[PDB]
Amino acid sequence: QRVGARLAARAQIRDIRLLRTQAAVHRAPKPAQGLTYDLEFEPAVDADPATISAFVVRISCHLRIQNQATQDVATADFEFAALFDYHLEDDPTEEELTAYAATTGRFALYPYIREYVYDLTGRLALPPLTLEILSRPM
Amino acid sequence: DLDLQRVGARLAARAQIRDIRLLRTQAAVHRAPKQGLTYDLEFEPAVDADPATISAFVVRISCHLRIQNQADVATADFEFAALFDYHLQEGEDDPTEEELTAYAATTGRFALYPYIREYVYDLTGRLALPPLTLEILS
Amino acid sequence: DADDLDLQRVGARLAARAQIRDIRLLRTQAAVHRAPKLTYDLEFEPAVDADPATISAFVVRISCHLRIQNQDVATADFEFAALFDYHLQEGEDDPTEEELTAYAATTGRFALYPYIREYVYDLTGRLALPPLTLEILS
Amino acid sequence: LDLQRVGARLAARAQIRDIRLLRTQAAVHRAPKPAQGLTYDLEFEPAVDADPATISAFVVRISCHLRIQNQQDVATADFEFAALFDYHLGEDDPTEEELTAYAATTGRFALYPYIREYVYDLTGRLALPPLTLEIL
Amino acid sequence: EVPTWHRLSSYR
Amino acid sequence: EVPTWHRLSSYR
Amino acid sequence: EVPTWHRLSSYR
Ligand SMILES: [Ca+2]
Ligand SMILES: [Ca+2]
Ligand SMILES: [Ca+2]
């Protein structure tokens, strides 16, 4: 929030892309037994602010869909990227970039991640998984 | 911005997002993208609430999008709803109409905006335009 | 039903020379009216654009009307287009309306159907309805 | 021509029930320079799963290897689709020749439009110009 | 009369 | 096994 | 190198 406020007033989002994906369905789902999921996110930022005034926020995801009552029905590992640039006056530091990625970066990318999960699970013929809407402090 | 923020700030503390949905959409591509592109996005907030009977409310944001060549290529008119729950302290009075509208203009908007962004990006890509990534909400 | 294999004979000359270049959504409109507590009806209307004395290319469009009801909840009206190129050898004649309309109803339709099916799936999700996955066309 | 003939007895009694993605693996390895032409190579291979003494239905799987380059890979994908067919039969079971024949002909042909839409969707998500696979 | 909705899910 | 599947739907 | 990517067109 504060650590990244300075970069937040000067940074503009440019584009979003999928970097990579890998997924497979292993077994039939069993809603009636109880179907569940685990979703691990890992954020990262790529920058080199002395050479270019552009950075990339990446979120790596690991999705595990499982039959309860705990057997795996499908798994996916994918990663999205968001491209930003800024107009400077002092270069952004690693802390500033990290805080911005953790807040604006993460919440910009989350809807793309949710849409992808919904699309993928549909394509694998699983019950469509719609992730929860994540709260953000205003 | 900051004065509406002030007025909807007790709501920011008591309320949490539950879900979003697209309520309606209309879009057509008119003319080919040539030169560079540009866009215009106008929004109007509204809120549906009945605090005497239910401690949840719906924020609605209506949007008019125009995409153009820098010198109309495509237009879209759509409306999103975000459903919120709130939880008062014992004895706290109900949100008023002014807190509700203020919140819908500020935090409601802020919560929805990244979903609007993903929708616009998806829609423009489908219409076979250069995918549009909406600018950061300042 | 069975009138479709005649249309494959009538479009075969053109099918042997035509090539697909692009697909795109041209327009869409959609709304949710009422709560889902379902059934649906989906109507298609193919059409072809050509002028085989200016350009050796044509466009297959399929206009779709979707209605969802409880045993109306939501309606959608959208159109998809596919862009085809063709090349005529030294003697050949231009495709006639009969060959164009027959290729449209067959190769066009089958090429477009997956996109319609995916759009339907995505759209019902964004409207927060139970996701609708159309049956595979034979 | 040939396999159309071998497959025709099964083709006249079989109906497609559903299509699904089984697996996918894809990456953008080097961003394409904007608007410089892209080329593609698609390799497919049909396989069929069947046990006519147990079940009068079978699954056609098409596995796909997609390489995209500039006109040194820009992007790659490896994925597999499945089509589930049901059939109705004193007629004999289909033999492994009728099944393989159907799979490399009617099966491939019913799957190919869905393979096209997936490649389009996936290339678009990778921020490439969406690719529209050629007519089969 | 707030127009709330409930999204159905097969997941817990 | 023939790896068949059935997709759930709320529709008819 | 930062792994940026670039479109032909842009909306800036
Ligand atoms: Ca409440
Ligand atoms: Ca031509
Ligand atoms: Ca059977």
Q: What is the 3-state secondary structure (H, E, C) of D41-105?
A: EEEEEEEEEECCCCCCEEEEEEEEEEEEEECCEEEEEEEEEEEEEEECCCCCCCCHHHHHHHHHH
Q: CA gyration radius for chain A? A: 18
The span from the CA of B41 to the CA of B50, in Å, is 30
DSSP classification of residue G8: S
Report how far residue B106's alpha carbon sits from residue A118's, in angstroms, rounded to the nearest whole number: 28
Contacting subunits of D (3+ beta carbon pairs below 8 A): A, B, C, F, G
Which residues in C lie closer than 8 A to residue F7 (C-beta atoms)?
Answer: 133
Structure tokens at B17: 């997002």
**Extended beta strands in B1-138, E state:** 15-29, 37-49, 56-69, 74-86
Q: Which two tokens stand for residue C101?
A: 């309309």
Q: Tokens for D84?
A: 């589930």
Pairing of strands C39-50, B37-49: unpaired
Residue among D18, D23, D28 whose CB faces A19 most closely: D28
Residue C26: name the closest of C65, C73, C63, C68 by CA.
Answer: C63
Count of CA atoms in the C-beta half-sphere (13 A) of B30 = 11
Closest CA to C107 of C67, C60, C72, C52: C60
Reading the block at residue B123, the tokens are 């829609």
* Distance of alpha carbon A49 from alpha carbon A98, whole angstroms: 13
Tokens of A131: 């992730």
Listed in sequence order, the DSSP H helices in chain C are 4-10, 12-17, 97-103, 109-126
What residues in A contact C124, CB-CB < 8 Å?
none
Chain C positions touching D15 (Cβ under 8 A) are 138
Q: Indicate yes or no: CB of E8 within 8 angstroms of CB of C35.
A: no
Ligand nearest to the CA of B14: 1
Work out the number of other CB atoms within 10 angstroms of the CB of residue B28. Answer: 15
CB pairs under 8 A between C and D: 35
Q: Please name the method used to determine this structure.
A: X-ray
Against chain F, the chains showing at least 3 CB pairs within 8 Å are: A, C, D
Maximum distance among all alpha carbons in chain B? 61
- Nearest ligand to the CA of D55 is 3
Environment class of residue C69 by beta-carbon count within 10 Å: exposed (0-12), middle (13-18) or buried (19+)?
middle
DSSP D12: T
Resolution reading in Å: 1.8
Collect all residues of chain E within an 8 Å Cβ-Cβ radius of residue C35. 5
Segment 1-12 of chain E within 8 Å of chain A by CB = 7, 9-12
- Ligand 1 centroid–CA B81 distance in Å is 17
- Strands lying side by side in the sheet with D38-50: A35-47, A54-67, A71-86, A11-25, D14-28, D73-87, D57-70, D38-50
Distance CA A14, CA G11 (A): 9
Cβ burial of B62 (10 Å; 0-12, 13-18, 19+) is middle
Structure tokens at F12: 């008819």
Helix (H) or strand (E) holding D112: helix D108-125
How close is the Cα of C52 to the center of ligand 2, in Å?
9
Whether residues B133 and A9 touch (CB distance < 8 A) is answered with: no
Q: Which of C103, C110, C112, C135 is nearest to C9 (CA)?
A: C103
CA-closest candidate to residue C39, choices C14, C67, C78: C67
Q: Is D26 on the interface with A (CB under 8 A)?
A: yes
Of C19, C115, C118, nearest to D135 by CB-CB distance is C19
What is the token pair recorded at A126?
A: 């699983």
- Nearest chain D Cα to A119, which residue? D121
Q: Tell me the one-letter amino acid at B89.
A: Q
Interface probe for E, chosen from B19, B23, B24, B47 (most Cβ of E below 10 Å), is B19
Place of tokens 């969707």: D121
Phi then psi for residue D44, to 5 deg, are -125, 160
CA nearest neighbour of D18 among C89, F7, B111: F7
CB contact under 8 A, G4 and A52: yes
Decide: A48 and G2 in contact? Cβ < 8 Å.
yes
What spacing in Å lies between the alpha carbon of D83 and ligand 3's midpoint?
A: 14
Percentages of chain C per state (helix, strand, coil), in multiples of 5: 30, 40, 30
Measured distance CA(D23)–CA(D20) in Å, rounded: 9
Ligand 1 centre and the CA of B82: distance in Å? 15
CA of A76, closest CA in chain F: separation in Å?
Answer: 19
Interface of C with A in 102-121 (CB under 8 A): 121
For chains C and E, CB pairs below 8 A equal 4
Using CB atoms within 10 A of its CB, is residue A57 exposed (0-12), middle (13-18) or buried (19+)?
A: buried
Q: How far is F7 from chain D (nearest CA, A)?
A: 8
Residue A119 phi, psi (nearest 5):
-70, -45
Q: Give dist(CA C63, CA A89) in Å, integer.
A: 55
Instruction: Find, among C95, C71, C75, C93, the residue nearest to C85 by Cα.
Output: C95
| Burial grade of A103 (CB within 10 A; 0-12, 13-18, 19 or more) | middle
